[PDB]
Amino acid sequence: PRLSLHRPALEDLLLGSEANLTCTLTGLRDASGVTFTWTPSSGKSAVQGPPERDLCGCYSVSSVLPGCAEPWNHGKTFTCTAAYPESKTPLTATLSKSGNTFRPEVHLLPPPSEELALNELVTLTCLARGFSPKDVLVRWLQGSQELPREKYLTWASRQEPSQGTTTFAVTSILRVAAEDWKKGDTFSCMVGHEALPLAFTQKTIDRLAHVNVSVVMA
Amino acid sequence: KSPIFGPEEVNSVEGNSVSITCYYPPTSVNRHTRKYWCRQGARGGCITLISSEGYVSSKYAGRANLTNFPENGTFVVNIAQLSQDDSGRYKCGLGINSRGLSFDVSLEVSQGKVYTVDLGRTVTINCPFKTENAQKRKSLYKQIGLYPVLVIDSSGYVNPNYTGRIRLFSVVINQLRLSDAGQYLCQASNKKNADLQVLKPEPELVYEDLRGSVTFHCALGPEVANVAKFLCRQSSGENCDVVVNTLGKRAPAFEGRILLNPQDKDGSFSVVITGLRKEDAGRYLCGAHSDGQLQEGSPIQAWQLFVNEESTIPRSPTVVKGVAGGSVAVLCPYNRKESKSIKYWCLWEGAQNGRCPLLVDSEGWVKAQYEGRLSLLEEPGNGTFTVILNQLTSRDAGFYWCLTNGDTLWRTTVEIKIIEGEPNLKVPGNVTAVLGETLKVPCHFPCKFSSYEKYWCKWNNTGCQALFVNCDENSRLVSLTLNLVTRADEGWYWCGVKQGHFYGETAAVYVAV
Amino acid sequence: VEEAKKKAKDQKEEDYRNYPTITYKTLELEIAESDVEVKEETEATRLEKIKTDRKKAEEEA
């Protein structure tokens, strides 16, 4: 019977439109009887759709406020207030933007040097280190073509061990062909956070970023 | 030389499939390392197209797999749904793509009344016509260089390249050379076309070790089953250095190693070569011609040999020497993975085709004229067994073969030579006893054998067993004592030395009550 | 039959102590077993045809 005012995603906050806040109410018993109220009525189009996707014999109501990113980047505290008929005190919860926001530090690491003599594929790595809100968005580019999200594997954003503040980390790997690397294409990781001016840090690597033997024979 | 081996040359047509087997030494490194199938493009760079670590290239996605058989000691690559861009040069191999351990395959697919016959056999050509040609000139014509030149014309006239060969509905032509693969036209005033395609038969791939043995099973037809078969090798050019022949030839280097087995009820025989060297790897064409040589028109059958020098077969003494009166104790190896078998021993007699009749086997049958002078120990176990043969004369000088009754072929040969000297262990000749009272026999032995273990064994047909026996250590003498001689204490006795398991010189005396 | 059933054994041993490196049946064991199976009759006429012709292929060779 709990209440969660889940924040917008980071996708539509950078590119798209429907920056919807998701006030989910999970674990109520009978059938219905909900009432959802919010504080900034700026396009209030109340949808609920109470599904069976609830994991128990107690349903959910996933309320949505649509079209709000202009109030979100400002920082007005959005407050979701749900009246459910099994009590009279409403489930009230609030959330806003985060206070400390550090910015990512993209590092596009090259292929490891033993992968190139196998001639199968090569492995580009994109570490993104030290951001203070948790949400991040990694994209990859070849030339200037955005690659679709089933060609690269992206791990989660976990907390790193720090004796500074609460900072995080992300890794994304792209295995690309050996001939496309060996010819000399340019591959770019693009890490997007809400704590950047241009909202997309981008790094780029190609094949081009000394043996010197001396035979002292006899 | 890289120890990998597979097909030098593959062919197909479009839409087809191939399966390419590459053979490697089955040590414990080769069977767990990655196997690749790369493509040898120009400028340098063999790009991996499939691998044994999961990687399947986008070109070969959904239409190839690489499956690895370690026990056989090979791996195979199945390529489906071919096309004319799947031609060119490839490599199979083990490991990193640039560091050797590879075989260069050259796969050339091609574009797809077709008479496909094998070399040397005979062809039926069905020539129908129109029945306004009842009694005309029922013939063939060949288009040599795109020009209709006569072959056989309805009355016995045959061009003398084809004499004694072709006869006259359908026609039939025997003994197909490679100069019979043109575009024939039957003709009775109308013409019919049919193209002959004589096929060279493909080599099998024999992958043997160094100092090993190879069995060539030459199953030609039963309609050629009366003709004098042969086993050519193929030179760098065009000829034949015939190894064995059924007409009483044998190659002068294959003395003692070769064996042509007798035929079957349907022709299929086998040749067994042992002790393979580095110059034995080549192309071997077994065929059947009355001349005893590869002429033209004989139905060949070819193998392609590879003598792997990374050989698991241990370097044994290939010549043993014993004096005229002495003993030899040869060690014959076998495969450690199969212990319990019957184990043989031959004397290679040439002079008919190269037979090899058994002297002794392990289950206890010793030949008739080798009673008391031959024994087959199973010592030391795990991949060896001793064969002791004493009382040597110069009628024992020859080659002897260490066979097994196992699914593996370590069928080694070893030559025994008779050098001038005298034996070490010195026993009396053929002593006698008197019933009841005792018998003592002396066996001298020189200073070399003074650390060894001595015995006396009563030779049964199933092998010795060491017996009473004293061993005086100051005076070099080991002595038998048969205390109250009965009837069941007779037959041969052997006084030889040993070292734990590795038996040595033995000398024989027979007792007569 | 008893003279024939021991003629398979007198043969099969001799195709074992004379050709130890073999897997097929060298035609004399196959003659000797068919002369056991008769004691059908037309199926053994081939093996006496093959051997005699191979012995008429010995009069020149």
Binding site: - | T27, V29, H32, T33, P317 | -
Partner: protein, 128 residues
Amino acid sequence: RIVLVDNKCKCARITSRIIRSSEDPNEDIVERNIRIIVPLNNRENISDPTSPLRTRFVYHLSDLCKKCDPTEVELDNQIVTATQSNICDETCYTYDRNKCYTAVVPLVYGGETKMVETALTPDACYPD
């Protein structure tokens, strides 16, 4: 051409060939192809991955042509086993492909310190 040496610890592969001269009376050619591989990333102690990275590579002909396997030989009646070597017990520049190289590190597993063995060249360290 014949193969004199196939050292797999220095990766030296001396092969040789007497290119005769049927036109020169006593001016023949005796070739001596040597084929060193320099590993360029291997350590100094190759069995211990803490050691500094090796930069000097010394290849003495006598320390790699050596035959440290005993032989058997025949003297006028008998067989004697000789030790045809003059120098045996080296340091190794490259791993051997057929040989298993291992390193023992102390990992913990909680309330202990289990000295586990790791594989420095796997695909050659498989048991049976």
